[PDB]
Structure formats: structure tokens, C-alpha cells
Amino acid sequence: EPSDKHIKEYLNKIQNSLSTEWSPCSVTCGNGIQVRIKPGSANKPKDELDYANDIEKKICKMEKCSS
Amino acid sequence: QVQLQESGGGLVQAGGSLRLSCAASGRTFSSYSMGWFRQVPGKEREFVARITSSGGNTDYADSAKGRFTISRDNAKNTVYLQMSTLKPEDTAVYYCAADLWQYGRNSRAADYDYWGQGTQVTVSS
């Protein structure tokens, strides 16, 4: 699984893009995360978003990484 | 990774005030959102306050709103918890925690990444 670290660093990168639309996969190969704002929370200011309740996350599986 | 060490806990009379400190190793302190939790026997840590890495915005549990103030000094690599109007029910071990998510709100112990050793606050009536 994508680690908590990975997920949070991705959230830090795309904070200003974060919306109710699912983000791209955070990785181009291997397993990563997609994130979005829970639609019922579209109204909240972005610095009021609760990590567990307003940020939805799911694993996205891409092609294997080269070695 | 960073290492956290809390201090400032002790014995305080009810109605009193107390300031706890939590210092971090390394030079990446400022990239972490910092939280304070507290723990009583038989129960898991409960959220007290949070201060984000990006913009120093703050958030408070219901038990702490109006009474407590969380602040940080990144030059000193320290986050602070200023508590006032202390009651016996506030007796607990107080923990600081670091969270790599730099924005927003976060009140679950499971969703923080690094933990201090805790400092005991005893409030007598």
C-alpha cells in the first residue's frame, strides 16, 4: 500500500489543486493514491478540511515500475 | 523523521495555568503540522490542539477551545501548549505529535506520524 508519508506528501504537493474531482494517480508506475474533497464538504474553506472526514483517498494501480 | 521531547509538566492548583513545550531534533520541524494530545489510564490519547506547518493555523478540541493556546517557534524547533483555567479533569499525560500533512485539520492519534514521550500534568483541587 501507499504509505501515510506518500499520501501526505502528495496532498502537500497538490493542495492548491485539491477539488471534489479525483486527482490523477500520484504515481506513474506501481501503486499510488488518488485524493479528492468529499463532495458534501465542497463548501468548507480548504484549511478547515479534516484529513479523515473531508479528504477521500483510494489506491490507484499503474503498470509495474522498472528495476 | 524527527524526534520529539515534551517538558513542562507538573503539579498545578485548580484554576491555574501551565505552559508545556515540545522540542524537535533535526532541521525539518517547520514542515510538520504539530498536535497536542492527552491520555488518561484505560483510554487512548485524545486530541487537544493542532497547528499547521503551512500558515500556522490552529484548531482546538472542545475541551480546549478558549482555554488553551497552541503556538510554535520554528527557529527554536519548538511547539507550545499554553493552558489556563486548569481543572482536575485535565490531569493526564500530554503528548506532542508531528504530522506530515501541512494543511487543514487532524484530530485522530492514528493519523499523526511521530510521537513524543509525554509529560505528566497533575491538577489538584
Author numbering:
A (entry chain B): 310 to 376
B (entry chain A): 1 to 125
Sentences from the paper on this structure:
The SPZ’s main surface antigen, the circumsporozoite protein (CSP), plays a pivotal role in SPZ biology and constitutes the immunodominant target for host antibodies. PfCSP contains an intrinsically disordered N-terminal domain (PfCSPN), a flexible linker region composed of NANP and NVDP repeats (PfCSPrep) and is flanked by N- and C-terminal junctions (PfCSPNTJ and PfCSPCTJ, respectively) and a globular C-terminal domain (PfCSPC) adopting a so-called αTSR fold that is connected to the SPZ plasma membrane via a GPI anchor. In this paper, we describe the functional characterization of 12 camelid single-domain antibodies (sdAbs, also known as nanobodies) targeting PfCSPC. sdAbs correspond to the variable domain (VHH) of heavy-chain only Abs (HCAbs) found in camelids (llamas, alpacas, camels, and dromedaries). A structural characterization of the sdAb-PfCSPC complexes through macromolecular X-ray crystallography (MX) and/or AlphaFold-Multimer shows that most sdAbs target the non-protective α-epitope.
The crystal structures reveal that sdAb1 and 9 target the PfCSPCα-epitope. The sdAb1 hydrophobic residues L101 and F103 are substituted by W101 and Y103 in sdAb9.
